[PDB]
Every structure is written in C-alpha cells, then in structure tokens.
Structure 1
C-alpha cells in the first residue's frame, strides 16, 4: 500500500519549476514519511525515482557520512526544504541544485544549510517508464486541451447570444451614448483565422516550461483528479 499511496500522491501533485545551475527543469516530487517519488523532465526526457526508507538511510549515510537520523526525519527535512521552492520561485531557502547526466540516469544533487549546516542529497532518477510518463504528461495534456476547447466553444456561444442581444437592442430603436464602445459582430471563423495568423507563434512558445507551470496547473490538477477518480 505504501507504493500505491506514493504513486497516487505523486500523480495528484502539480508540476514545479527548478532553476538549476545554468539550466531549468520541471520537477514533481511527493514526499511522505515512508519515502518519496520524484519525476523530473526538461521537455526532452523524463526521469523517475521511487525511493523507500531503507535506501534513504543507506544513501544518507553514504553522502553525509556524519549525520545520524532516522529515515522519517530525513524525509521530513527534505520535504520541508523542497516545498518552498516548488510553491514559489525566488525563495531564499538556500537550496543549491545541480544536475549530472551520466549514462541514461540523472543525478540531481541538492545542497542545503540545515540551520547553517551542510545537508546533501542525491536523486538517482532513471528514465521514466512509458506508462508513467504517458499517464503523467500525455493523457492529462490531452484532457486539458479538450477542456480548453470546450471552454472556447462555451465562450463562443455566449458571445453569439450577446451579439443577438445587441442586434435586438439596435432593432429596438436606440443609440449608444458614446461611439467608441461599439463592437463589430463576432465571427468564430474570422476570429480563429486572425488568432492563428497573428498570436499563434507567441502562444505556442513553451520555452523552458515556465508558462506551462504558470498558467496551466489548476486545469492540469483538475484533469488529473478526474482521471484518477475515473480509474
């Protein structure tokens, strides 16, 4: 049950932006007293790591070599360090992050000052399985796109209703107090064509993933919750 709980918690968690040394990553970490589950990406490859208590203790002793703490305390400290950075950027949490690409694995090194005290951790994230990356990125993104298309359709029909109201008002025999407020009739085809011609290049620019985690997280979380509830 511990593994299932960790997987569910990771799935429910939203994406966050990590500013490594001269690089950027999209990270999604769920940490509980029994271990943690991390999923990192850079829009080109996705690495995953599910880690339990025994390996946590082994790695902590190997790295720190002088810190004697139980796995639960280590997990709690790691979660406390990581949460402020994921929640918001530019947080002076004193968490230096480094990335190493050796073989197909990824070494994510985190250094912190635990009350002015070195604290080192290393995520050995192997390549994510096709099923995990699929259910975490592809299906949720398709659901988000479908939901946004439905929202666009609802807005278009509401705009058509408002246009009909404006036409009825004009037919009633009334004139606007001003003239700048006049709005030309809304056409779905013309609006879509103009958008595609003009604003599509700017909107489509994902860049380093910051827009995705800035404007497409509430919808992503809702879609993921719906998917997990369904099955």
Structure 2
C-alpha cells in the first residue's frame, strides 16, 4: 500500500498553496490506505507518508468533537486538497498554516466535517535526495530537453515557411518591397535577442505559481514516462 502511494504521488502535478504567511508548492496522493505528500518552498523539499493507523491515531489527537473511520478522514482530506489544487479561485472555507522545527515542517489545516470543526496536521520531514531527484531534478531536466526539442521543431517549421515565401518571391509575386514583412528566421539572432530582451522576465520563478500554471501537463507527461521506463 505504501509503494502505491509513492507511485501515485510521482504522477501528481504540483499545486500552489496559499498559507497564512507564505505559500508552498504541494502534491499529494490519497487513497483508503493513507497519503503521500510532497511540499516545497523552492529552497527545501519536505515529505510525509502515512498509513491508516497513523490517520486513526492523529485524528483522535486533533479531534475531540467527532470520530469516523480512517478512510472517511482520508476521503475528506482529498475533497479539501483536490479543488484548491486546480485553482485557488475556489470558495474554500478551509485554512492552512505552517511552522518549522529543524528539519521538520508542520502543515496545519482547519476545515469543517459533519458541520463540526475538523483539524489535521501534516508532519513533514526533509525529503530524501532520491525523492528530490525523482520528483524535481530528473523531470525538470527531462522537461527542459523536451522544450528544447519543441524549439528545434518550430525552427524547422519556420525555415519551411520562409522557403515557401522565397518560392513566391522568385516567381514574380512581388518585385519591389512595398511593406514591412517578417525577416527570414535566423535562429542565432532569435536566441541572442531573446537572452537580452526576454530572458530576465521569462525565467522568473517567483512564488512558483508560473510553474504550476504553465508547465504541469508537461511535468505529468515527463514523470509518467520515467515510471514506465523504470519498470
């Protein structure tokens, strides 16, 4: 059951999570057997994995006003984290905060369940280098390579467009330049102008929201490919 949580987690996309003070990037995978969570502030990465015993134990610690089976608690957590993952323009009514103690991060949630207050704390510890490698380094590297291939493919398409434009010009379509048209595509000058004019703003990580809003289709496609290769 624990192996399957970590498997499922690898193919989750990253969500942005508004908290009391700051924000975090978060991915979670929840079943009837437990959850696996990965959280990052773009400096450090933390991880938690729990089974149903731990769910029972901790739900009893944090919640005097109700009780329910572990799976029902796991279901509620999924209902909480799921819609807010997709966009934070969703009317939540749940609150999040976190605090740090050496190599630990505690993510605290307050929501409601059965018309009562419900509390849950995720006790996260610094992620193993293997999990950082698996969920962040390898896929981000794979993505950059794939995006570079997209770039080379679009450069190829552009040269063919220019070849077709040349074909018209050489057959008498136009004899004098009579208007501002595009210049033939040259990749070296495209690149050099990009770095000067566009790079500073284009590469801006910020609070991580650009990554979550722009690159998750590619991210999931890339982590999925490694899972399938690693078998």
* TM-score normalised over the length of structure 1: 0.95
134-143 or 95-104, which deviates more: 95-104
Structure 1 position 185, deviation (Å)? 0.9
| Alpha-carbon separation, structure 2, partners of 1:176 and 1:6 | 67
Structure 1 position 170, deviation (Å)? 0.3
SS of residue paired to 2:62: helix
Whether contact under 8 Å (2:97, 2:107) holds in the other structure is yes
Structure 1 position 90, deviation (Å)? 2.2
Structure 1 position 103, deviation (Å)? 2.2
| Alpha-carbon separation, structure 2, partners of 1:143 and 1:8 | 18
| Alpha-carbon separation, structure 1, partners of 2:13 and 2:41 | 15
Structure 2 counterpart of 1:103: 102
The two structures, once aligned, show a CA RMSD in angstroms of 1.6
176-185 or 118-127, which deviates more: 176-185
Distance 1:202 1:33, change over 3 A: same
Query: Where does 1:199-210 land on structure 2 (aligned, <5 Å)?
Result: 199-210=198-209
Structure 1 position 63, deviation (Å)? 0.5
Structure 1 position 116, deviation (Å)? 3.8
Deviations 1:145-198 (A, max 9, x none): 000000000000110111111111100101399955621111000010000011
Structure 1 position 66, deviation (Å)? 3.0
Distance 1:180 1:67, change over 3 A: farther
Structure 1 position 82, deviation (Å)? 1.2
Whether contact under 8 Å (2:108, 2:120) holds in the other structure is yes
| Alpha-carbon separation, structure 2, partners of 1:105 and 1:189 | 47
Whether contact under 8 Å (2:169, 2:175) holds in the other structure is no
1:87 corresponds to 2:92: no
1:78 corresponds to 2:87: no
Distance 1:180 1:85, change over 3 A: farther
Structure 1 position 9, deviation (Å)? 0.7
| Alpha-carbon separation, structure 2, partners of 1:79 and 1:179 | 62
Structure 2 counterpart of 1:152: 151
SS of residue paired to 2:212: helix
Distance 1:195 1:74, change over 3 A: same
| Alpha-carbon separation, structure 1, partners of 2:64 and 2:102 | 26
Structure 1: which 5+ residue stretches go unaligned?
Answer: none
Whether contact under 8 Å (2:84, 2:92) holds in the other structure is yes
169-178 or 97-106, which deviates more: 169-178
Structure 2: which 5+ residue stretches go unaligned?
Answer: none
Q: How many correspondences in the alignment?
A: 229
Whether contact under 8 Å (2:21, 2:97) holds in the other structure is no
Deviations 1:91-113 (A, max 9, x none): 11211000111221001000002
Structure 1 counterpart of 2:185: 186
Distance 1:173 1:127, change over 3 A: same
Q: After TM superposition, which residue ranges in structure 1, 4 or more long, deviate above 6 angstroms?
A: none
Distance 1:177 1:16, change over 3 A: farther
